[PDB]
Amino acid sequence: RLPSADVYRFAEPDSEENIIFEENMQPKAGIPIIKAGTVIKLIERLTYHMYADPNFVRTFLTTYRSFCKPQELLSLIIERFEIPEPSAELKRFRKEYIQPVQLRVLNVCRHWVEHHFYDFERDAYLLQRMEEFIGTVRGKAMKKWVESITKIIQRKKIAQSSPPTVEWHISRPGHIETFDLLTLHPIEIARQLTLLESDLYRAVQPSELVGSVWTKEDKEINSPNLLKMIRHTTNLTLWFEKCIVETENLEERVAVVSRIIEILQVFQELNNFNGVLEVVSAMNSSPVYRLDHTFEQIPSRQKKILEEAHELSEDHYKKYLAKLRSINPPCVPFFGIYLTNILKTEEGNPEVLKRHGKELINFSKRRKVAEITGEIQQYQNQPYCLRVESDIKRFFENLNPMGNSMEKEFTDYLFNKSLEIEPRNPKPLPRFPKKYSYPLKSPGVRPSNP
Amino acid sequence: HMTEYKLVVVGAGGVGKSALTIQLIQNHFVDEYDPTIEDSYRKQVVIDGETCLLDILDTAGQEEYSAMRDQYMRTGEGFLCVFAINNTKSFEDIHQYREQIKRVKDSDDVPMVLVGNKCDLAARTVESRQAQDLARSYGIPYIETSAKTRQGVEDAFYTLVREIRQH
Numbered sequence A: 001r002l003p004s005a006d007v008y009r010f011a012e013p014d015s016e017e018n019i020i021f022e023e024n025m026q027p028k029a030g031i032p033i034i035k036a037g038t039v040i041k042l043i044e045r046l047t048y049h050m051y052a053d054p055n056f057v058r059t060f061l062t063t064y065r066s067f068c069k070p071q072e073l074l075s076l077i078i079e080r081f082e083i084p085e086p087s088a089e090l091k092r093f094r095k096e097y098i099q100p101v102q103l104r105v106l107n108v109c110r111h112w113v114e115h116h117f118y119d120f121e122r123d124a125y126l127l128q129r130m131e132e133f134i135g136t137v138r139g140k141a142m143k144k145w146v147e148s149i150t151k152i153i154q155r156k157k158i159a160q161s162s163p164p165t166v167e168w169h170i171s172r173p174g175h176i177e178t179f180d181l182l183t184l185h186p187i188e189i190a191r192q193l194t195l196l197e198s199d200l201y202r203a204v205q206p207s208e209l210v211g212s213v214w215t216k217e218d219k220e221i222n223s224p225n226l227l228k229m230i231r232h233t234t235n236l237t238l239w240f241e242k243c244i245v246e247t248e249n250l251e252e253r254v255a256v257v258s259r260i261i262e263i264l265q266v267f268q269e270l271n272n273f274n275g276v277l278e279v280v281s282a283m284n285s286s287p288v289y290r291l292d293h294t295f296e297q298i299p300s301r302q303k304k305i306l307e308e309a310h311e312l313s314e315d316h317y318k319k320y321l322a323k324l325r326s327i328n329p330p331c332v333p334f335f336g337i338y339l340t341n342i343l344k345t346e347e348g349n350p351e352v353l354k355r356h357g358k359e360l361i362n363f364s365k366r367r368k369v370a371e372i373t374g375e376i377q378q379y380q381n382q383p384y385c386l387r388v389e390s391d392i393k394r395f396f397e398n399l400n401p402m403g404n405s406m407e408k409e410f411t412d413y414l415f416n417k418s419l420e421i422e423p424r425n426p427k428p429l430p431r432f433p434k435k436y437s438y439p440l441k442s443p444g445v446r447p448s449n450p
Numbered sequence B: 001h002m003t004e005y006k007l008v009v010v011g012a013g014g015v016g017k018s019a020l021t022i023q024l025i026q027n028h029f030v031d032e033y034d035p036t037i038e039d040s041y042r043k044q045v046v047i048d049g050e051t052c053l054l055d056i057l058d059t060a061g062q063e064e065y066s067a068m069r070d071q072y073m074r075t076g077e078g079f080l081c082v083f084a085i086n087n088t089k090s091f092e093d094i095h096q097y098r099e100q101i102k103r104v105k106d107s108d109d110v111p112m113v114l115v116g117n118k119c120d121l122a123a124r125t126v127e128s129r130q131a132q133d134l135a136r137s138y139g140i141p142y143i144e145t146s147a148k149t150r151q152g153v154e155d156a157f158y159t160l161v162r163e164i165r166q167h
């Protein structure tokens, strides 16, 4: 027997007007899947007495800010904990309702501070209230969980075998002044860029993605790690194009395209799909795509490598998607797909479902977004067994192919360079002098030492 | 085999461009959308009594991958250049989008349509006549659409298919 809704809101029974479910059950746990409900019913199920629901807690705490503010959530979980009484009945209620519920709200508080501490870093009064609440919790059964929460808060307030030998080509260790596309070793370009891109991939948090906040006016405040990651990717595509169209001599430009395809081959080996696609985007750009005299002189083996990479992107990433699903970490996924799927999930589904005239929060929409962020995180756990080279790393971090130019200015310059080096038919192909005073022959993509 | 039209949606981010394609594909009376499945971007339609398949590419959310536009744009035969009627910057960006499409396709006459989307109850800053004037200057159709009511969505897409057929 539970108290009245007039005294305790979470006692109100379930109905089609306050909670609705999906036909299926949690695959591994046999728990019903909540489709929609009121904030009171979602909070009740977040801290349910019958069973624990880690998947729902994980989903809720990731995606709740679209329908409930952090202050309002804390107020709701404090209310839930403060259970009033409605002998045999009283002793059973304390053990089958009050004790399990109070423990579940403490697990929520613990999951919140551990995995979503940003809410507290961003609102110091929210933490003041959490600490005040956690102070008022009493009981021998609670002390274990209350100490753990305090231990996390204070920790949050404070803040393998041998890898392969680093590969060198024309540029030697320490001689950063000569580092360039053709002087650094194609294997080391790909490894050092895979390390940068892997770290950029791993720094992106769900707080930057949930709510499509990277597309909104405050995207620079709310999605900074995602945008640094996209901007590096964009910079490498532009650098690859620049290298190509600024090599005016055909023989040297054939050598440039060929080396970039070797860097692609190594990105494929390393499962760096962001890198693979940086190269495919450069090759399919307007200035590079049209360079028929350059691509004709490219070895067939390399044409086929580039062609298979291009095909990953075809038919809405069909082959990319299957290839990613089949490989295991470490890998660097292409983020763009995730971004489009989160946006369209949020924009293509309603925030609310209406049942018998009452508004219900659409939780399934949120679950679908938490499914995408979970898949992003599964690839963020494993690092590459590759040694960092601090000078090569720095060279790629500081590439600035655009310079002080704006996007239009620069991409028009690249396109006008393309038309100059390979004019539009029936204009004859001019000749241009060499710019490289070192050998153009590649060392290959096979390691030089065992 | 029925004809398949590869369409590409292009436009500014942050102004609800994804609604145009989501509303086309979605059956009205079903508001449940899953961008993960093939059926979410492929639709069988009958335009002027001739059945065809529309394959629509909308990279909504990947605007910062500015060096991937050429790649994505090259997949298309027809383009929907979309702006929000409540955002003048998105309208002003159309000129460059079109210029890239022309460059990518290596053609001054690429099947294209100008779409003005009413994405929310924010105030209109782009008058119908401004967009109708711009569309005329390029020699292309202008369609206004409502993201809330589905008004104009089918006309935008069907007008593009007719532009491709009459190319």
Ligand SMILES: OC1(c2ccc(Br)cc2)CCNCC1
Pocket: A280, A283, A284, A288, A289, A290, A291, A292, A295, A306, A307, A310
């Ligand atoms: O063979 C071309 C090519 C193929 C694949 C990619 Br990716 C980029 C370009 C270059 C030469 N013009 C035709 C396409």
